[PDB]
DNA sequence: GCTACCATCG
DNA sequence: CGATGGGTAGC
């Protein structure tokens, strides 16, 4: 809460457009879930690939409802006891079903960095480490860093939607390349996650 | 009523 | 290459 206040004040100290956007959108309501284990955050991030928040939620809901006896997130063991065929019925694509099964195996076999180690890793180190997982690359690791880890300076410059918002926000003539979004949002440090969140709220206006 | 909107695999 | 998951905003 205090972090967001500070972030909001910083974003309101850059050029005029950031100040205006923050005022119109209001307080940042981003709610990460660092209590989630790495395998859960990773699976949630994989599921969201190419899908809206609502679509992703309906899939995870079925997943938790069917593959869990307490409606909580399925444990690695439970996921392992489920064949890809059944996972696909939940709404996971066939490819994602395979990847999620592998992530579950990895968690069970202690092949995924522990949450403790993940917390000591810089984003660059997290990228190098988690990118070793099939189905997990830049975008997915950024989402995991934002929505699970709660990191505050993550700019998912490669996000298609954010790029569309950046085009409008910065008054660009064409959808910007990832490198360009990175350059334009530099002033937002060290709260680029919050800056991204605000850009993501532009449609809701 | 329509339908556009991550990362992997033969 | 060309498929791929699904709720829903914009038409």
PDB file of N, CA and C in Angstrom, chain A residues 93-172:
ATOM      1  N   UNK A  93      -4.926 -25.743 -23.414  1.00  0.00           N
ATOM      2  CA  UNK A  93      -4.677 -26.210 -24.768  1.00  0.00           C
ATOM      3  C   UNK A  93      -3.897 -27.509 -24.603  1.00  0.00           C
ATOM      4  N   UNK A  94      -3.866 -28.333 -25.642  1.00  0.00           N
ATOM      5  CA  UNK A  94      -3.121 -29.584 -25.565  1.00  0.00           C
ATOM      6  C   UNK A  94      -1.650 -29.309 -25.249  1.00  0.00           C
ATOM      7  N   UNK A  95      -1.076 -28.305 -25.898  1.00  0.00           N
ATOM      8  CA  UNK A  95       0.320 -27.959 -25.647  1.00  0.00           C
ATOM      9  C   UNK A  95       0.510 -27.539 -24.188  1.00  0.00           C
ATOM     10  N   UNK A  96      -0.357 -26.652 -23.714  1.00  0.00           N
ATOM     11  CA  UNK A  96      -0.260 -26.194 -22.335  1.00  0.00           C
ATOM     12  C   UNK A  96      -0.455 -27.338 -21.342  1.00  0.00           C
ATOM     13  N   UNK A  97      -1.336 -28.279 -21.671  1.00  0.00           N
ATOM     14  CA  UNK A  97      -1.578 -29.413 -20.782  1.00  0.00           C
ATOM     15  C   UNK A  97      -0.282 -30.185 -20.572  1.00  0.00           C
ATOM     16  N   UNK A  98       0.458 -30.388 -21.657  1.00  0.00           N
ATOM     17  CA  UNK A  98       1.721 -31.112 -21.593  1.00  0.00           C
ATOM     18  C   UNK A  98       2.728 -30.331 -20.749  1.00  0.00           C
ATOM     19  N   UNK A  99       2.816 -29.030 -20.994  1.00  0.00           N
ATOM     20  CA  UNK A  99       3.762 -28.193 -20.265  1.00  0.00           C
ATOM     21  C   UNK A  99       3.465 -28.121 -18.774  1.00  0.00           C
ATOM     22  N   UNK A 100       2.186 -28.026 -18.431  1.00  0.00           N
ATOM     23  CA  UNK A 100       1.778 -27.945 -17.038  1.00  0.00           C
ATOM     24  C   UNK A 100       2.106 -29.247 -16.314  1.00  0.00           C
ATOM     25  N   UNK A 101       1.970 -30.357 -17.023  1.00  0.00           N
ATOM     26  CA  UNK A 101       2.273 -31.648 -16.428  1.00  0.00           C
ATOM     27  C   UNK A 101       3.767 -31.699 -16.104  1.00  0.00           C
ATOM     28  N   UNK A 102       4.583 -31.188 -17.020  1.00  0.00           N
ATOM     29  CA  UNK A 102       6.029 -31.165 -16.830  1.00  0.00           C
ATOM     30  C   UNK A 102       6.408 -30.249 -15.668  1.00  0.00           C
ATOM     31  N   UNK A 103       5.740 -29.103 -15.562  1.00  0.00           N
ATOM     32  CA  UNK A 103       6.014 -28.181 -14.467  1.00  0.00           C
ATOM     33  C   UNK A 103       5.680 -28.873 -13.143  1.00  0.00           C
ATOM     34  N   UNK A 104       4.594 -29.643 -13.131  1.00  0.00           N
ATOM     35  CA  UNK A 104       4.189 -30.361 -11.927  1.00  0.00           C
ATOM     36  C   UNK A 104       5.254 -31.388 -11.552  1.00  0.00           C
ATOM     37  N   UNK A 105       5.760 -32.115 -12.550  1.00  0.00           N
ATOM     38  CA  UNK A 105       6.798 -33.123 -12.320  1.00  0.00           C
ATOM     39  C   UNK A 105       8.016 -32.442 -11.721  1.00  0.00           C
ATOM     40  N   UNK A 106       8.411 -31.333 -12.344  1.00  0.00           N
ATOM     41  CA  UNK A 106       9.573 -30.567 -11.911  1.00  0.00           C
ATOM     42  C   UNK A 106       9.448 -30.133 -10.459  1.00  0.00           C
ATOM     43  N   UNK A 107       8.265 -29.646 -10.091  1.00  0.00           N
ATOM     44  CA  UNK A 107       8.019 -29.204  -8.723  1.00  0.00           C
ATOM     45  C   UNK A 107       8.180 -30.396  -7.790  1.00  0.00           C
ATOM     46  N   UNK A 108       7.543 -31.509  -8.141  1.00  0.00           N
ATOM     47  CA  UNK A 108       7.634 -32.719  -7.330  1.00  0.00           C
ATOM     48  C   UNK A 108       9.076 -33.186  -7.151  1.00  0.00           C
ATOM     49  N   UNK A 109       9.877 -33.067  -8.205  1.00  0.00           N
ATOM     50  CA  UNK A 109      11.265 -33.505  -8.149  1.00  0.00           C
ATOM     51  C   UNK A 109      12.263 -32.422  -7.750  1.00  0.00           C
ATOM     52  N   UNK A 110      11.749 -31.323  -7.207  1.00  0.00           N
ATOM     53  CA  UNK A 110      12.593 -30.222  -6.765  1.00  0.00           C
ATOM     54  C   UNK A 110      13.509 -29.702  -7.866  1.00  0.00           C
ATOM     55  N   UNK A 111      12.986 -29.620  -9.083  1.00  0.00           N
ATOM     56  CA  UNK A 111      13.769 -29.143 -10.216  1.00  0.00           C
ATOM     57  C   UNK A 111      13.528 -27.660 -10.482  1.00  0.00           C
ATOM     58  N   UNK A 112      12.536 -27.093  -9.805  1.00  0.00           N
ATOM     59  CA  UNK A 112      12.216 -25.676  -9.956  1.00  0.00           C
ATOM     60  C   UNK A 112      12.895 -24.933  -8.814  1.00  0.00           C
ATOM     61  N   UNK A 113      13.418 -23.724  -9.074  1.00  0.00           N
ATOM     62  CA  UNK A 113      14.066 -22.995  -7.977  1.00  0.00           C
ATOM     63  C   UNK A 113      13.048 -22.806  -6.854  1.00  0.00           C
ATOM     64  N   UNK A 114      13.494 -22.884  -5.603  1.00  0.00           N
ATOM     65  CA  UNK A 114      12.580 -22.705  -4.482  1.00  0.00           C
ATOM     66  C   UNK A 114      12.142 -21.245  -4.454  1.00  0.00           C
ATOM     67  N   UNK A 115      11.048 -20.957  -3.760  1.00  0.00           N
ATOM     68  CA  UNK A 115      10.571 -19.586  -3.673  1.00  0.00           C
ATOM     69  C   UNK A 115      11.645 -18.720  -3.024  1.00  0.00           C
ATOM     70  N   UNK A 116      12.324 -19.278  -2.026  1.00  0.00           N
ATOM     71  CA  UNK A 116      13.379 -18.553  -1.328  1.00  0.00           C
ATOM     72  C   UNK A 116      14.483 -18.119  -2.283  1.00  0.00           C
ATOM     73  N   UNK A 117      14.895 -19.019  -3.166  1.00  0.00           N
ATOM     74  CA  UNK A 117      15.941 -18.694  -4.124  1.00  0.00           C
ATOM     75  C   UNK A 117      15.439 -17.734  -5.187  1.00  0.00           C
ATOM     76  N   UNK A 118      14.187 -17.909  -5.590  1.00  0.00           N
ATOM     77  CA  UNK A 118      13.592 -17.037  -6.588  1.00  0.00           C
ATOM     78  C   UNK A 118      13.572 -15.595  -6.080  1.00  0.00           C
ATOM     79  N   UNK A 119      13.356 -15.420  -4.780  1.00  0.00           N
ATOM     80  CA  UNK A 119      13.307 -14.083  -4.192  1.00  0.00           C
ATOM     81  C   UNK A 119      14.674 -13.394  -4.160  1.00  0.00           C
ATOM     82  N   UNK A 120      15.746 -14.180  -4.216  1.00  0.00           N
ATOM     83  CA  UNK A 120      17.104 -13.631  -4.193  1.00  0.00           C
ATOM     84  C   UNK A 120      17.640 -13.401  -5.604  1.00  0.00           C
ATOM     85  N   UNK A 121      16.849 -13.758  -6.609  1.00  0.00           N
ATOM     86  CA  UNK A 121      17.278 -13.596  -7.993  1.00  0.00           C
ATOM     87  C   UNK A 121      16.835 -12.277  -8.607  1.00  0.00           C
ATOM     88  N   UNK A 122      17.706 -11.690  -9.422  1.00  0.00           N
ATOM     89  CA  UNK A 122      17.371 -10.456 -10.112  1.00  0.00           C
ATOM     90  C   UNK A 122      16.467 -10.907 -11.254  1.00  0.00           C
ATOM     91  N   UNK A 123      15.780  -9.970 -11.897  1.00  0.00           N
ATOM     92  CA  UNK A 123      14.901 -10.339 -13.001  1.00  0.00           C
ATOM     93  C   UNK A 123      15.721 -11.018 -14.104  1.00  0.00           C
ATOM     94  N   UNK A 124      16.954 -10.558 -14.309  1.00  0.00           N
ATOM     95  CA  UNK A 124      17.822 -11.143 -15.333  1.00  0.00           C
ATOM     96  C   UNK A 124      18.134 -12.604 -15.007  1.00  0.00           C
ATOM     97  N   UNK A 125      18.347 -12.885 -13.730  1.00  0.00           N
ATOM     98  CA  UNK A 125      18.656 -14.242 -13.306  1.00  0.00           C
ATOM     99  C   UNK A 125      17.409 -15.115 -13.387  1.00  0.00           C
ATOM    100  N   UNK A 126      16.261 -14.534 -13.045  1.00  0.00           N
ATOM    101  CA  UNK A 126      14.992 -15.249 -13.113  1.00  0.00           C
ATOM    102  C   UNK A 126      14.726 -15.646 -14.556  1.00  0.00           C
ATOM    103  N   UNK A 127      15.008 -14.726 -15.474  1.00  0.00           N
ATOM    104  CA  UNK A 127      14.806 -14.974 -16.894  1.00  0.00           C
ATOM    105  C   UNK A 127      15.661 -16.137 -17.370  1.00  0.00           C
ATOM    106  N   UNK A 128      16.942 -16.112 -17.011  1.00  0.00           N
ATOM    107  CA  UNK A 128      17.865 -17.169 -17.415  1.00  0.00           C
ATOM    108  C   UNK A 128      17.483 -18.525 -16.834  1.00  0.00           C
ATOM    109  N   UNK A 129      16.975 -18.519 -15.610  1.00  0.00           N
ATOM    110  CA  UNK A 129      16.590 -19.753 -14.934  1.00  0.00           C
ATOM    111  C   UNK A 129      15.260 -20.354 -15.386  1.00  0.00           C
ATOM    112  N   UNK A 130      14.189 -19.572 -15.314  1.00  0.00           N
ATOM    113  CA  UNK A 130      12.880 -20.085 -15.695  1.00  0.00           C
ATOM    114  C   UNK A 130      12.674 -20.309 -17.189  1.00  0.00           C
ATOM    115  N   UNK A 131      13.457 -19.629 -18.026  1.00  0.00           N
ATOM    116  CA  UNK A 131      13.334 -19.804 -19.470  1.00  0.00           C
ATOM    117  C   UNK A 131      13.755 -21.211 -19.874  1.00  0.00           C
ATOM    118  N   UNK A 132      14.335 -21.951 -18.932  1.00  0.00           N
ATOM    119  CA  UNK A 132      14.756 -23.324 -19.200  1.00  0.00           C
ATOM    120  C   UNK A 132      13.532 -24.249 -19.212  1.00  0.00           C
ATOM    121  N   UNK A 133      12.411 -23.753 -18.695  1.00  0.00           N
ATOM    122  CA  UNK A 133      11.176 -24.527 -18.627  1.00  0.00           C
ATOM    123  C   UNK A 133      10.382 -24.425 -19.930  1.00  0.00           C
ATOM    124  N   UNK A 134       9.992 -25.572 -20.471  1.00  0.00           N
ATOM    125  CA  UNK A 134       9.217 -25.612 -21.705  1.00  0.00           C
ATOM    126  C   UNK A 134       7.896 -24.866 -21.519  1.00  0.00           C
ATOM    127  N   UNK A 135       7.663 -23.863 -22.363  1.00  0.00           N
ATOM    128  CA  UNK A 135       6.439 -23.084 -22.288  1.00  0.00           C
ATOM    129  C   UNK A 135       6.604 -21.796 -21.505  1.00  0.00           C
ATOM    130  N   UNK A 136       7.776 -21.614 -20.907  1.00  0.00           N
ATOM    131  CA  UNK A 136       8.050 -20.428 -20.098  1.00  0.00           C
ATOM    132  C   UNK A 136       9.167 -19.576 -20.699  1.00  0.00           C
ATOM    133  N   UNK A 137       8.810 -18.402 -21.213  1.00  0.00           N
ATOM    134  CA  UNK A 137       9.806 -17.489 -21.776  1.00  0.00           C
ATOM    135  C   UNK A 137       9.586 -16.061 -21.241  1.00  0.00           C
ATOM    136  N   UNK A 138      10.183 -15.057 -21.886  1.00  0.00           N
ATOM    137  CA  UNK A 138      10.095 -13.667 -21.413  1.00  0.00           C
ATOM    138  C   UNK A 138       8.749 -13.178 -20.886  1.00  0.00           C
ATOM    139  N   UNK A 139       7.729 -13.210 -21.738  1.00  0.00           N
ATOM    140  CA  UNK A 139       6.392 -12.736 -21.371  1.00  0.00           C
ATOM    141  C   UNK A 139       5.831 -13.454 -20.154  1.00  0.00           C
ATOM    142  N   UNK A 140       5.922 -14.779 -20.163  1.00  0.00           N
ATOM    143  CA  UNK A 140       5.409 -15.587 -19.061  1.00  0.00           C
ATOM    144  C   UNK A 140       6.137 -15.293 -17.747  1.00  0.00           C
ATOM    145  N   UNK A 141       7.450 -15.100 -17.815  1.00  0.00           N
ATOM    146  CA  UNK A 141       8.225 -14.808 -16.612  1.00  0.00           C
ATOM    147  C   UNK A 141       7.899 -13.406 -16.092  1.00  0.00           C
ATOM    148  N   UNK A 142       7.620 -12.473 -17.000  1.00  0.00           N
ATOM    149  CA  UNK A 142       7.244 -11.120 -16.590  1.00  0.00           C
ATOM    150  C   UNK A 142       5.910 -11.150 -15.835  1.00  0.00           C
ATOM    151  N   UNK A 143       4.938 -11.891 -16.366  1.00  0.00           N
ATOM    152  CA  UNK A 143       3.633 -11.997 -15.725  1.00  0.00           C
ATOM    153  C   UNK A 143       3.766 -12.654 -14.349  1.00  0.00           C
ATOM    154  N   UNK A 144       4.603 -13.688 -14.256  1.00  0.00           N
ATOM    155  CA  UNK A 144       4.842 -14.376 -12.979  1.00  0.00           C
ATOM    156  C   UNK A 144       5.476 -13.398 -11.987  1.00  0.00           C
ATOM    157  N   UNK A 145       6.405 -12.585 -12.482  1.00  0.00           N
ATOM    158  CA  UNK A 145       7.096 -11.608 -11.645  1.00  0.00           C
ATOM    159  C   UNK A 145       6.149 -10.538 -11.118  1.00  0.00           C
ATOM    160  N   UNK A 146       5.180 -10.155 -11.945  1.00  0.00           N
ATOM    161  CA  UNK A 146       4.221  -9.127 -11.572  1.00  0.00           C
ATOM    162  C   UNK A 146       3.080  -9.645 -10.703  1.00  0.00           C
ATOM    163  N   UNK A 147       2.363 -10.635 -11.223  1.00  0.00           N
ATOM    164  CA  UNK A 147       1.200 -11.160 -10.538  1.00  0.00           C
ATOM    165  C   UNK A 147       1.407 -12.129  -9.391  1.00  0.00           C
ATOM    166  N   UNK A 148       2.557 -12.790  -9.340  1.00  0.00           N
ATOM    167  CA  UNK A 148       2.825 -13.690  -8.230  1.00  0.00           C
ATOM    168  C   UNK A 148       3.876 -13.075  -7.304  1.00  0.00           C
ATOM    169  N   UNK A 149       5.081 -12.856  -7.825  1.00  0.00           N
ATOM    170  CA  UNK A 149       6.169 -12.309  -7.025  1.00  0.00           C
ATOM    171  C   UNK A 149       5.918 -10.920  -6.433  1.00  0.00           C
ATOM    172  N   UNK A 150       5.144 -10.094  -7.129  1.00  0.00           N
ATOM    173  CA  UNK A 150       4.864  -8.756  -6.633  1.00  0.00           C
ATOM    174  C   UNK A 150       5.993  -7.771  -6.885  1.00  0.00           C
ATOM    175  N   UNK A 151       6.850  -8.066  -7.857  1.00  0.00           N
ATOM    176  CA  UNK A 151       7.951  -7.158  -8.158  1.00  0.00           C
ATOM    177  C   UNK A 151       7.383  -5.865  -8.731  1.00  0.00           C
ATOM    178  N   UNK A 152       7.951  -4.744  -8.299  1.00  0.00           N
ATOM    179  CA  UNK A 152       7.471  -3.418  -8.684  1.00  0.00           C
ATOM    180  C   UNK A 152       8.067  -2.726  -9.911  1.00  0.00           C
ATOM    181  N   UNK A 153       9.200  -3.205 -10.417  1.00  0.00           N
ATOM    182  CA  UNK A 153       9.836  -2.542 -11.554  1.00  0.00           C
ATOM    183  C   UNK A 153       9.901  -3.379 -12.819  1.00  0.00           C
ATOM    184  N   UNK A 154       8.833  -4.126 -13.088  1.00  0.00           N
ATOM    185  CA  UNK A 154       8.771  -4.969 -14.273  1.00  0.00           C
ATOM    186  C   UNK A 154       7.994  -4.276 -15.387  1.00  0.00           C
ATOM    187  N   UNK A 155       8.657  -4.033 -16.515  1.00  0.00           N
ATOM    188  CA  UNK A 155       8.004  -3.429 -17.670  1.00  0.00           C
ATOM    189  C   UNK A 155       7.879  -4.509 -18.742  1.00  0.00           C
ATOM    190  N   UNK A 156       6.673  -5.069 -18.906  1.00  0.00           N
ATOM    191  CA  UNK A 156       6.456  -6.109 -19.914  1.00  0.00           C
ATOM    192  C   UNK A 156       6.314  -5.399 -21.255  1.00  0.00           C
ATOM    193  N   UNK A 157       7.440  -4.863 -21.722  1.00  0.00           N
ATOM    194  CA  UNK A 157       7.506  -4.105 -22.959  1.00  0.00           C
ATOM    195  C   UNK A 157       7.079  -4.891 -24.189  1.00  0.00           C
ATOM    196  N   UNK A 158       7.121  -6.216 -24.082  1.00  0.00           N
ATOM    197  CA  UNK A 158       6.768  -7.112 -25.176  1.00  0.00           C
ATOM    198  C   UNK A 158       5.276  -7.465 -25.202  1.00  0.00           C
ATOM    199  N   UNK A 159       4.527  -6.982 -24.217  1.00  0.00           N
ATOM    200  CA  UNK A 159       3.096  -7.268 -24.148  1.00  0.00           C
ATOM    201  C   UNK A 159       2.338  -6.543 -25.263  1.00  0.00           C
ATOM    202  N   UNK A 160       1.634  -7.308 -26.094  1.00  0.00           N
ATOM    203  CA  UNK A 160       0.876  -6.747 -27.213  1.00  0.00           C
ATOM    204  C   UNK A 160      -0.086  -5.635 -26.812  1.00  0.00           C
ATOM    205  N   UNK A 161      -0.906  -5.900 -25.801  1.00  0.00           N
ATOM    206  CA  UNK A 161      -1.874  -4.917 -25.326  1.00  0.00           C
ATOM    207  C   UNK A 161      -1.184  -3.664 -24.795  1.00  0.00           C
ATOM    208  N   UNK A 162      -0.146  -3.852 -23.988  1.00  0.00           N
ATOM    209  CA  UNK A 162       0.572  -2.708 -23.447  1.00  0.00           C
ATOM    210  C   UNK A 162       1.119  -1.877 -24.608  1.00  0.00           C
ATOM    211  N   UNK A 163       1.629  -2.553 -25.634  1.00  0.00           N
ATOM    212  CA  UNK A 163       2.156  -1.860 -26.806  1.00  0.00           C
ATOM    213  C   UNK A 163       1.060  -1.026 -27.465  1.00  0.00           C
ATOM    214  N   UNK A 164      -0.144  -1.579 -27.564  1.00  0.00           N
ATOM    215  CA  UNK A 164      -1.250  -0.836 -28.155  1.00  0.00           C
ATOM    216  C   UNK A 164      -1.565   0.389 -27.295  1.00  0.00           C
ATOM    217  N   UNK A 165      -1.520   0.218 -25.977  1.00  0.00           N
ATOM    218  CA  UNK A 165      -1.797   1.336 -25.078  1.00  0.00           C
ATOM    219  C   UNK A 165      -0.701   2.385 -25.149  1.00  0.00           C
ATOM    220  N   UNK A 166       0.540   1.926 -25.256  1.00  0.00           N
ATOM    221  CA  UNK A 166       1.672   2.834 -25.353  1.00  0.00           C
ATOM    222  C   UNK A 166       1.557   3.669 -26.623  1.00  0.00           C
ATOM    223  N   UNK A 167       1.091   3.060 -27.712  1.00  0.00           N
ATOM    224  CA  UNK A 167       0.956   3.802 -28.962  1.00  0.00           C
ATOM    225  C   UNK A 167       0.024   4.992 -28.754  1.00  0.00           C
ATOM    226  N   UNK A 168      -1.102   4.751 -28.092  1.00  0.00           N
ATOM    227  CA  UNK A 168      -2.071   5.812 -27.843  1.00  0.00           C
ATOM    228  C   UNK A 168      -1.545   6.815 -26.823  1.00  0.00           C
ATOM    229  N   UNK A 169      -1.051   6.298 -25.701  1.00  0.00           N
ATOM    230  CA  UNK A 169      -0.527   7.124 -24.620  1.00  0.00           C
ATOM    231  C   UNK A 169       0.594   8.071 -25.046  1.00  0.00           C
ATOM    232  N   UNK A 170       1.576   7.549 -25.773  1.00  0.00           N
ATOM    233  CA  UNK A 170       2.702   8.366 -26.223  1.00  0.00           C
ATOM    234  C   UNK A 170       2.453   9.043 -27.572  1.00  0.00           C
ATOM    235  N   UNK A 171       1.257   8.855 -28.124  1.00  0.00           N
ATOM    236  CA  UNK A 171       0.940   9.464 -29.404  1.00  0.00           C
ATOM    237  C   UNK A 171       1.906   9.064 -30.505  1.00  0.00           C
ATOM    238  N   UNK A 172       2.116   7.763 -30.662  1.00  0.00           N
ATOM    239  CA  UNK A 172       3.023   7.258 -31.685  1.00  0.00           C
ATOM    240  C   UNK A 172       2.240   6.992 -32.964  1.00  0.00           C
TER     241      UNK A 172
END
